[PDB]
Design a protein around this ligand. Structure first.
Ligand SMILES: O=P(O)(O)C(CNC1CCCCC1)P(=O)(O)O
Ligand SMILES: O=P(O)(O)C(CNC1CCCCC1)P(=O)(O)O
Ligand SMILES: C=C(C)CCOP(=O)(O)OP(=O)(O)O
Ligand SMILES: C=C(C)CCOP(=O)(O)OP(=O)(O)O
Ligand SMILES: [Mg+2]
Ligand SMILES: [Mg+2]
Ligand SMILES: [Mg+2]
Ligand SMILES: [Mg+2]
Lengths: 360, 360
């Protein structure tokens, strides 16, 4: 604890600064300011703050080994915090816009922002645009005279682009690639020939791992001026693997976790999603199951969903998950040893990250 | 001419570079690459390219007065071009997303991107996100080692934020400020007490002038290293005024220009927009007209629209437009004289801009 309530207080000065800049510069009336205060809180708070705290943890590690003034430690911790929020604000940006795209109902127990009676799709879309816009003013204000700014903005811009690309990958995985046409309406795949592990990993990589694990870990280094004390390739590879597992957990939970516990009602089967469950099923199933899959997958009607959820329990997908989990634990622990070669404290910060995903 | 076909060719290497980066780095299959090629072309091309060419024109002015190598002139012109596209790409970003928000049908004679059979609201939203994402890679690639990068990115980020803010201002102008509540559905204004010129100018300023005139003019200076050769306050003020007029033209045209000539079917009256027409009407009308306005404005039914369009012709709004146009020509020409004090060639580039708005 402690570091979290210190991360939460940094949110408050971000929120204050942004709304002050709006008032004193952007001619905002106290009412619209109020709207944007509630907007922020609803889309940014409520979560575990796990991605943002990751910047704080990596930064916190190096303080133990590195000699800094008291005022220096406080400067680094503060930047890790603004870095933390830059990310959660980038996520809240995507979440808001992803849910409108998907057509979601619940998220963290509460309705999706656009479903708020006095928001509407018309506003939420723009609110999303503002959320990411805010990540930039944070950067330009707080890190105005930091040597890591040009690097950090550049890392941020590319991470963002990666996420947007992966968002396209995700939303187009149910129709056939060769049939993709802006002028022809997109029909659902019948053959499911693009439900491979190679295409699946391609989706997850960009749509999640980059921003959920890469961005936070490297921002931790950036704020701590320790990018020189890691092999960057190594940092890259670990984040793509721990992040892949993160989404694989999501995919399973979706299908097999009560609405109350999940925070939402999962519709990947309805949405014809290219999930871990689907890909792994089709890498296991006999022709008779495959046919009973095609004839029932990607449909809204609960009875068709039952067939799929019934199939998965019989197809024993807890088996391959275990086998996947233990192959991940295998390669994650391998990379941490490799990390200890240049950066022992970063290695154990990555280690802390792994458990914090494995455990949850 | 000439400079335009040179601006269009710079688009081609931007498009090539982006799709190459996607292929060789982002693992894009030739089909999705195709989608994003068509997306770009449809949302970026078709327009007059007037905002982007403005960077080119300002840059072109200084080449006549400033001694540069041949290879230097070509470097500056090229940056003005990538600067030009950064802006048109930022606009195409907003247009795509604005039309989804408003619920539009036509734009430049062709349907709105989301209305394309094989696009859908689900994809277009993300496509919009990518369009602005592309403005950043342009910047980071082409201007990688330019002294104006930190300035230019910072100008871009703030311009963008201004536009998003103004987008909120625009979309919330039909309901009462004190009633704004994320949890209460937004009813339309009955009193229209916020249809003032002071609130109207506040909308237009942020939602248009910043990106349509400010961004292009200053980017022209940035690429030419002549930000030191202008009073920036002066450049600011002129762009907020020529841009205000630009939107005022739009507002009139909307109501009074055939669908064929306009490129779209105007529904500001249906959309209950805070237009120049409405504001100026309520600053002119007697109580009997005002009542026949309230009872007919903000409604979809064509008969109610007829009443409003009928009122405007009788309310003689060509009068106040003339009076506005000649008060604008008045203050625009004033500022150009003031501009000639420090920057004679920029002054005449601003002058070229004014006519290119007045004429069109
Ligand atoms: O949390 P979810 O389940 O809605 C996830 C939504 N994914 C987006 C998260 C934010 C960045 C883009 C992908 P997914 O359906 O992919 O599991
Ligand atoms: O060209 P339009 O008419 O759809 C304009 C849409 N405005 C947006 C343009 C792009 C930036 C945000 C405002 P407006 O309705 O405001 O006249
Ligand atoms: C985006 C996904 C895949 C859901 C988790 O997001 P959260 O934002 O709720 O995660 P925490 O920050 O709460 O850990
Ligand atoms: C955004 C508005 C107010 C409509 C004009 O946009 P365009 O993009 O069509 O303008 P040009 O670049 O064609 O001049
Ligand atoms: Mg989703
Ligand atoms: Mg899911
Ligand atoms: Mg509009
Ligand atoms: Mg209009």
């Amino acid at each position: 604890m402690a570091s979290m309530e210190r991360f939460l207080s940094v949110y408050d000065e971000v929120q204050a600064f942004l709304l002050d800049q709006l008032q004193s510069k952007y001619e905002i009336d106290p009412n619209r300011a109020r709207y944007l205060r509630i907007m922020m809180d609803t889309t940014c708070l409520g979560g575990k703050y796990f991605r943002g705290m990751t910047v704080v943890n990596v930064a916190e590690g190096f303080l133990a080994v590195t000699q800094h003034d008291e005022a220096t430690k406080e400067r680094i911790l503060h930047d890790a915090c603004v870095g933390g929020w830059m990310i959660e604000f980038l996520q809240a940006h995507y979440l808001v816009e992803d849910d409108i795209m998907d057509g979601s109902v619940m998220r963290r127990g509460k309705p999706c922002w656009y479903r708020f009676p006095g928001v509407t799709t018309q506003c939420a879309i723009n609110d999303g645009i503002i959320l990411k816009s805010w990540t930039q003013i944070m950067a330009w204000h707080y890190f105005a005279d930091r040597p890591f700014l040009k690097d950090l903005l550049c890392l941020f811009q590319k991470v963002d682009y990666a996420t947007a690309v992966g968002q396209m990958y995700d939303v187009t995985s149910m129709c056939d690639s060769n049939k993709l046409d802006p002028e022809v309406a997109q029909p659902m795949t019948t053959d499911f020939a693009e439900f491979t592990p190679a295409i699946y990993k391609r989706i997850v990589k960009y749509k999640t791992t980059f921003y959920t694990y890469l961005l936070p870990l490297v921002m931790g280094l950036f704020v701590s001026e320790a990018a020189a004390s890691v092999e960057m390739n190594l940092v890259e590879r670990v984040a793509h693997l721990i992040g892949e597992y993160f989404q694989v957990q999501d995919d399973v939970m979706d299908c097999f976790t009560p609405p109350e516990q999940l925070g939402k009602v999962g519709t990947d089967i309805e949405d014809a999603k290219c999930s871990w469950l689907a890909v792994t099923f089709l890498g296991k199933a006999n022709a008779a199951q495959v046919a009973e899959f095609k004839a029932n997958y990607g449909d809204k009607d609960p009875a068709k969903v039952a067939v799929v959820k019934r199939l998965y329990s019989e197809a024993n997908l807890q088996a391959d998950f275990a086998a996947y989990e233990a192959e991940v634990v295998r390669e994650v622990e391998s990379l941490i040893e490799q990390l200890k070669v240049k950066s022992p404290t970063f290695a154990e910060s990555v280690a802390v990250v792994w458990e914090k995903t494995h455990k949850r």
